[PDB]
Design a protein around this ligand. Sequence first.
Ligand SMILES: *[C@@H]1O[C@H](CO)[C@@H](O[C@@H]2O[C@H](CO)[C@@H](O[C@@H]3O[C@H](CO[C@H]4O[C@H](CO[C@H]5O[C@H](CO)[C@@H](O)[C@H](O)[C@@H]5O[C@H]5O[C@H](CO)[C@@H](O)[C@H](O)[C@@H]5O)[C@@H](O)[C@H](O[C@H]5O[C@H](CO)[C@@H](O)[C@H](O)[C@@H]5O[C@H]5O[C@H](CO)[C@@H](O)[C@H](O)[C@@H]5O)[C@@H]4O)[C@@H](O)[C@H](O[C@H]4O[C@H](CO)[C@@H](O)[C@H](O)[C@@H]4O[C@H]4O[C@H](CO)[C@@H](O)[C@H](O)[C@@H]4O[C@H]4O[C@H](CO)[C@@H](O)[C@H](O)[C@@H]4O)[C@@H]3O)[C@H](O)[C@H]2NC(C)=O)[C@H](O)[C@H]1NC(C)=O
Lengths: 43, 245
Amino acid sequence: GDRVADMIESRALTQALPAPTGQNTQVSSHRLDTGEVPALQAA
Amino acid sequence: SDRVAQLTIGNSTITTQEAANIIVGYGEWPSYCSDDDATAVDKPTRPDVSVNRFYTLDTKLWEKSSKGWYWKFPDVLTETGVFGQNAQFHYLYRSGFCIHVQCNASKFHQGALLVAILPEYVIGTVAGGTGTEDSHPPYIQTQPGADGFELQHPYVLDAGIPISQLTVCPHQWINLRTNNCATIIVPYMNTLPFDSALNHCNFGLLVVPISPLDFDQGATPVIPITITLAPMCSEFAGLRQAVTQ
Ligand SMILES: *[C@@H]1O[C@H](CO)[C@@H](O[C@@H]2O[C@H](CO)[C@@H](O[C@@H]3O[C@H](CO[C@H]4O[C@H](CO[C@H]5O[C@H](CO)[C@@H](O)[C@H](O)[C@@H]5O[C@H]5O[C@H](CO)[C@@H](O)[C@H](O)[C@@H]5O)[C@@H](O)[C@H](O[C@H]5O[C@H](CO)[C@@H](O)[C@H](O)[C@@H]5O[C@H]5O[C@H](CO)[C@@H](O)[C@H](O)[C@@H]5O)[C@@H]4O)[C@@H](O)[C@H](O[C@H]4O[C@H](CO)[C@@H](O)[C@H](O)[C@@H]4O[C@H]4O[C@H](CO)[C@@H](O)[C@H](O)[C@@H]4O[C@H]4O[C@H](CO)[C@@H](O)[C@H](O)[C@@H]4O)[C@@H]3O)[C@H](O)[C@H]2NC(C)=O)[C@H](O)[C@H]1NC(C)=O
């Protein structure tokens, strides 16, 4: 019993994945690449 | 078809035309570490030619009253060549070995040797003689290097184990009426898949004359024993600066 639109319009970010063992280490090679840097983080 | 052989690996080959046969230690060849077994997460180096060579190390003269010798592997090759340079830079290490010991003599000399392997050949002492003082062996009896070391009491192999049942471990005989060399191919035996090359010595090469040398006077009295070994399927990991010991 209202005509207002204010009242009629009036949650986790993380998913628990199953992890029985520690994760594997896939094969990497060298990389000589600008633009993207995986070391420099922002603490 | 068995007396004559040729072992080429790396850039070095050895020919033999009075061999016995090649025995493969515990029935399997040396191989690389699978990804089911490896725990180190850095990519190993595998030189594949420069370290898989027959390194001829030393020459022991065998007279009529010898006892026996032993060489701790791989500490015979941590002072030699590109194996000795990669094993001093890298912390981890694994390899097999193709071990070839030559001892030629005429068709009038006699005598037999028991060149045998045994893994984790730990060395005891004489315990102060009477057996009451806990004496530990020195570093040179423990790890003699490429110079080798002569057994004091070869009946008990300096470890309280008899040489009469050394023949369980991978071995073959050099009796001078039949053969002149003895190839023993040894895989990598250790619990953990890589280990340090400077601390842990995986096995020892016991070379003991059981039946003594004998020859009438007039023949050549100098009968040498030279051992040549080849690290097969060697790989290293964990690069840092050079340690020597
Ligand atoms: C002071 O004082 C002091 C005191 O005296 C002194 O001291 C001294 O010193 C000196 C110097 O050094 C001396 O002398 C010397 O000596 C030496 C030693 O001897 C000893 O030893 C031996 C050993 O043996 C061994 O081997 C054998 C074989 O060979 C065997 O058999 C045995 O068994 C043994 O084995 C062992 O060991 C080994 C090692 O390697 C091991 O491996 C194993 O395992 C085992 O264990 C011995 O033998 C001897 O013995 C003797 O004695 C006895 C008694 O008991 C008898 O029985 C015997 O027989 C003997 O005797 C003999 O011999 C000797 C020689 O040896 C003579 O001399 C006599 O006479 C008789 O004949 C002993 O114990 C030595 O070696 C030396 O020698 C050398 O030199 C000389 C001069 O100098 C001459 O003459 C000779 O000939 C020789 O030469 C040679 O060598 C060299 C080096 O090595 C070379 O290089 C050359 O080349 C030559 O070679 C040649 O020849 C030969 C023949 O011989 C032939 O074979 C080859 O092939 C070639 O050709 C010297 O003499 C001393 O000793 C000391 N002392 C004492 C007491 O000892 C000091 O000096 C002072 N100071 C000053 C300053 O002066």
